[PDB]
Every structure is written in C-alpha cells, then in structure tokens.
C-alpha cells in the first residue's frame with residue numbers, strides 16, 4: 001500500500017531528529033546511537049501499524065470534506081503521522097515490558113527484545129522507558145505551536161495511565177483478589193472465581209481499548225480539529241467495543257494460530273492468564289471438564305498445555321466466538337449508524353477500522 | 363522537623379485522591395487498591411525527601427520576600443508540595459527499575475520492591491511505570507488552572523528523558539563502546555578504557571543531576587513564578603555540580619558505608635559499575651595495582667569483592683575525595699556568589715541545599 005510507505009517516511013524523519021538530538025544535546029557516542037537506532041527499529045517497526053494508520057485515515061476523511069490550502073492539507077497529514085508514531089512508540093514501550101512480564105520468546109517473528117543476546121532484561125526495561133519518553137519529546141517538538149497540544153498531552157497521559165492500570169489487572173489475574181499481599185508470595189487461583197465475563201471485560205478495557213482504539217480515533221480528531229463535530233460518548237463507546245473484540249481475537253490467536261503465521265509464540269495457558277478462552281470455556285464446561293481444566297491450567301508442561309488445548313477444542317469454542325462476533329457486528333453497526341447523525345466522514349472511518357480488525361489474521 | 367510533616371500531609375492528600383480516582387473511574391477492587399497503597403507507601407516514603415523539600419524551601423525563600431495574600435501564600439506552599447511529590451514519585455519510579463537493573467536486595471532498610479515475596483519482578487516493572495504515570499495525573503489535576511503548566515510539563519518530560527538516557531549509559535558502562543551489538547551478548551571490558559573522569563561525568567550528569575537538583579530548584583521557581591528573576595544558565599551549572607557531588611557521595615557510600623546506616627547493600631563492585639571509586643583508583647594506581655584490579659572487579663565472589671575493597675583502601679581514596687570536595691566547595695561558593703547578583707533569596711536556598719548534601723551520611 002502506498003499510504004503505509006508515506007507514514008513510514010515520517011518515522012525516518014522522526015528517528016533522524018531523535019538521534020541527532022541525542023548527539024547534539026545528550027553527548028551520545030556513535031555506537032550507543034547505533035544501539036538505540038536498532039532498538040527503535042526492532043521495537044517500533046515490523047507491525048501492522050493499525051494504530052498509526054487509524055489516526056491517518058480519520059484525518060484524511062475530514063480532509064476530503066473540508067476546504068484547506070495545499071500547505072494546510074500537507075501539515076495535517078504530517079501531524080497525523082507524528083500522532084501515529086507517538087502511538088506506535090507508546091505501544092512499543094508497552095510491548096517491551098509486556099514481553100518480560102509474560103515471559104514471551106518472540107515478537108513479530110523476531111525474538112522478543114529482551115531475548116536479543118546483546119540486550120538482556122536489565123537493558124530492556126530502560127529501553128522501554130525511553131520508548132515512552134520519545135513519544136513526549138516528539139510531542140513537544142512537533143506540536144509546540146499547535147492549538148491541540150494541551151488536549152493531546154492530556155489524553156495521552158490518561159490513555160497511558162489506563163494502560164498501566166490494565167496491565168496491573170492482567171498480570172495479577174491468576175490470583176485471588178482477597179489473597180493479594182505484597183508480603184506473601186502469590187499462589188495461582190485454585191477456584192478460578194475471577195474468570196467471569198465481567199472481570200475479563202474490566203481487564204481488556206483498560207489494558208487494550210484505550211491505546212488501541214480510543215487514542216488513535218480521537219488523535220485523528222485532534223489533528224483535524226474535529227473533536228467538536230462528533231459526540232465523544234459514542235467514540236468512547238465504539239472504541240471500547242472494537243477494542244474488546246480486538247483483544248478477544250488476540251486471545252484465540254494465542255492458542256489456535258500457528259507462530260509462523262502469528263509471529264508470536266503462545267503463552268497464556270502456561271501463565272494461567274484470564275483469557276477469553278479460559279473464561280468462555282468455564283462459561284459452558286461441565287463438572288468433569290472443569291476439574292480437568294483446574295488440574296492442567298497454568299503449567300509450562302507441554303502435556304498439560306496440550307490437555308487444555310484439547311479441552312478448548314472439544315468445548316466447541318469457535319462456536320461461541322462466532323456468536324460473540326455476531327453480537328458485536330450488530331452493536332458496531334449500531335454505533336456507526338449513530339455516528340452518521342453528526343459526522344458521516346468519521347462514521348465511515350470507524351466502518352473501515354472495524355472492517356480491518358474484523359478481518360485480521362495476525 | 364515540623365516542615366517535613368506538613369509536606370508529608372499533602373502525600374496523604376495526594377494518595378487519597380489517587381486511590382479514589384481508581385475506585386470511581388477505573389473500577390479497582392478493595393484489595394488491588396490496598397496493594398497499590400502499600401506499593402505507593404513502600405516506594406515513595408521512607409527517604410530523606412531531599413528532592414521534595416528543595417522545591418518547598420526554594421518557594422518559601424521567595425514567600426518571605428514577596429507580598430502575597432494569606433490565600434496565595436497558602437496555595438504556593440501547597441503547589442510546592444505537589445511539585446515535591448511529583449519529583450518524589452518520579453524518583454520512586456526510577457528506583458524500582460534501577461533495583462531490578464542493578465540486582466539490588468535492599469532499599470531504605472526494607473527489601474527492594476521487586477524482592478517483596480508478593481511482588482516479583484513481573485509486577486514491579488509495571489508498578490514503576492504506574493509511579494511515573496501518577497506524576498502526570500497529579501500534574502494535570504492540581505495544576506490545571508496554573509500559568510506554569512505548559513512549562514512544568516515540558517521541563518518534567520525533558521528531565522525525565524535525560525534520566526532514562528543516563529540510566530542507559532550507566533547500565534552499559536562495563537561494556538566496550540565499539541563492541542555494543544544487540545545481537546551479540548555483552549562481555550565486560552577487560553581494558554577499562556572507558557573508566558575516565560570524562561566518561562564518568564557524562565554518566566552522572568544525565569542519570570542524577572537533572573532529576574535531583576535541576577528539577578526541584580526550577581520547580582520551586584515555577585511554583586513561585588520566579589524563573590525570570592534568576593539566570594537559568596547558572597541554575598543548570600550549579601545543579602549539575604552539586605548533582606555530580608551527590609552521586610560521588612553515593613558511590614563511596616556504596617563501598618565504605620555499613621548497610622545498617624546506609625539502608626542499602628552495596629552492588630557496584632559486583633556489577634563492575636563505572637563508579638567514582640573505580641575511576642579514581644585507576645586514575646592513580648600503578649601497574650601491579652591495576653592488573654590485580656582487572657583480575658578481581660565485576661564478580662559477586664565475596665573474596666574478589668574484598669580484594670577490591672582492600673585495593674581501594676590502600677590507594678588512599680579518601681584523600682582523593684577530600685581534594686575533590688575542596689574543589690567543589692570552591693566552585694559552589696563561586697556559583698552561589700554569582701546567584702546573589704539577581705536573586706539573593708534563591709542564592710541562599712542553594713547555600714542551604716549544598717549544606718544538607720555536603721553533610722549527608724545516608
């Protein structure tokens with residue numbers, strides 16, 4: 001796609017500025033500059049760029065239906081790219097830490113950043129922190145004169161906070177709430193009482209929906225200066241729904257999608273994560289099925305993992321997924337329909353975003 | 363001290379707001395709210411609060427020499443406390459990650475946060491991230507109406523970035539620059555060619571001086587609205603000097619100060635850190651001394667650590683420290699003298715900050 005290459009060109013423009021600043025104002029040596037360049041490329045590139053490209057196509061939508069000088073058209077497009085990358089970089093930040101947390105071995109077909117021989121966990125933690133720091137630097141540089149600044153930084157902060165809170169919920173999802181004690185080591189849940197749709201929804205919302213759909217959609221609105229034209233309660237509502245779906249997809253892909261296609265090696269079962277599959281299974285399984293699940297979940301043992309994957313297949317889970325997908329298509333159509341009232345151009349943007357998500361394989 | 367208890371009361375006011383927001387807008391359950399409260403208390407409290415109390419006494423300085431209503435006097439003091447805590451929280455953030463990175467066992471007399479049985483490294487990484495996130499939340503809440511907002515956030519971002527960059531330099535200080543390769547595992551330096559005053563100064567500057575002296579001093583100036591009265595080039599110059607000293611202190615304390623007094627268990631030697639002691643030793647040691655240092659540095663082996671501590675003691679390092687301290691007192695007096703020209707009230711503030719630092723034991 002031609003549009004994806006134009007977005008990727010602003011990355012090179014962003015990377016060159018970021019590395020020159022390091023050299024000119026932070027006294028970095030060539031080899032450490034090289035290291036961070038490699039770190040940037042590995043962590044930030046290789047993905048679908050769904051999040052970056054959403055802020056671009058929300059922005060383009062308005063550009064087709066708005067009178068602007070050629071120069072303004074150009075600057076809004078450029079703004080959409082920097083906004084895109086900020087998000088991309090913000091995700092990169094979260095991925096790096098997520099991988100050390102979930103103990104993953106592979107991201108986007110290459111090894112996980114911390115698993116690079118010359119990196120190790122002790123560098124990666126800081127590398128991630130720099131990735132987040134970058135988002136703010138490229139904000140204060142590029143958007144220094146822009147009206148939408150205070151508002152962009154405020155949303156960024158808040159979206160970021162939700163993500164950290166969501167991450168906290170997720171990494172402690174295999175614990176019993178009432179047992180949580182910083183002084184006593186945490187045992188897995190034996191009863192799985194916190195594997196409810198409710199508690200799962202709560203997790204997904206904060207860890208996924210804010211940075212994945214809310215942020216790019218509203219960021220496209222900011223760069224366009226079109227926040228006022230749409231009803232923000234709908235955007236929050238649509239973003240949390242497509243966001244929920246996007247994470248449900250990610251969960252099934254973890255178990256049933258081959259790594260070569262996925263680019264990721266599954267880790268949920270071995271980590272006893274409160275995934276949609278675990279929750280949905282427990283949502284329909286019988287007494288014998290449940291007991292066998294309890295005796296097998298949360299182990300790195302290839303046999304116990306296989307017993308669970310068989311338990312999922314037998315429970316006919318891809319039937320439950322198609323019934324969930326059917327109900328989401330309804331509610332997304334609904335909300336897109338609602339969005340036409342005030343902003344037809346943003347309503348289609350959401351129709352396109354939903355389409356690309358509802359279609360993904362990796 | 364009475365002033366330290368008043369600052370600590372705003373912490374309780376900050377913590378209560380932060381935890382109520384979680385409950386009201388982020389759907390947190392009592393036990394997870396309890397967890398973060400404990401996490402906040404352990405990471406943020408227990409320290410000297412040098413950084414928080416500096417923004418307070420810079421602010422008070424101006425208040426004694428400026429006409430203000432009782433209400434304004436009160437609001438500026440309150441602002442100084444929130445500014446103080448932001449910094450305290452920003453440090454807390456860095457400490458948590460620093461401890462996993464340096465592999466430390468003890469912070470402020472208690473175990474390192476990640477070493478709490480009920481925490482583990484996988485939670486701690488995110489906990490740290492939340493600590494940083496908090497600083498921004500309490501910024502956007504408390505300083506939403508304040509003129510100094512854009513300027514405070516901009517400095518915070520930049521100071522934060524330097525710290526991450528400084529951290530990057532520090533964790534890779536036992537490597538050879540030219541060998542750094544994300545694909546090849548990193549061997550210790552055998553030649554120690556990057557153990558120069560220059561390279562050490564470069565490290566300390568970015569990892570310590572920005573968040574420890576620059577940030578609180580200028581933050582006190584912002585809350586007072588007094589940035590214009592002082593010359594910023596002097597503040598940057600004085601903060602990087604006292605900051606250098608503060609880190610030099612931290613290095614000697616690592617080796618020669620007993621943990622019971624320090625609250626920390628030393629880790630530099632075992633990690634082959636580019637510390638002031640290592641650099642200063644190599645700066646005066648002979649051929650036989652150097653070779654023995656090379657064959658012993660960077661090991662967790664109690665015997666090899668002891669051989670190094672003896673090498674430091676023999677090289678009469680506390681003579682070199684007193685000559686460095688003497689030269690810093692000169693240059694700090696100098697800069698304080700320079701600061702009297704435009705701002706006598708801030709000049710004393712720096713005279714007091716230097717005094718407390720030059721006096722510390724822990």
Ligand SMILES: O=P(O)(O)C(O)(C[n+]1cccc(F)c1)P(=O)(O)O
Nearest residue numbers: 094095098102167170207208250254
């Ligand atoms: O399966 P992955 O690693 O793609 C994941 O969705 C990433 N991720 C998603 C949301 C927040 C985050 F920090 C990280 P998860 O959390 O491991 O499921």
Ligand SMILES: O=P(O)(O)C(O)(C[n+]1cccc(F)c1)P(=O)(O)O
Nearest residue numbers: 456457460464529532569570612616
């Ligand atoms: O000895 P410590 O742990 O007090 C240290 O100064 C902390 N610290 C200082 C600066 C930045 C940072 F992230 C952390 P160091 O780095 O381990 O020497």
Ligand SMILES: [Mg+2]
Nearest residue numbers: 098101102170
């Ligand atoms: Mg995760």
Ligand SMILES: [Mg+2]
Nearest residue numbers: 098099102104
């Ligand atoms: Mg993961």
Ligand SMILES: [Mg+2]
Nearest residue numbers: 250251254268
């Ligand atoms: Mg997953």
Ligand SMILES: [Mg+2]
Nearest residue numbers: 460463464532
């Ligand atoms: Mg360190």
Ligand SMILES: [Mg+2]
Nearest residue numbers: 460461464466
């Ligand atoms: Mg340390």
Ligand SMILES: [Mg+2]
Nearest residue numbers: 612613616630
């Ligand atoms: Mg130290």
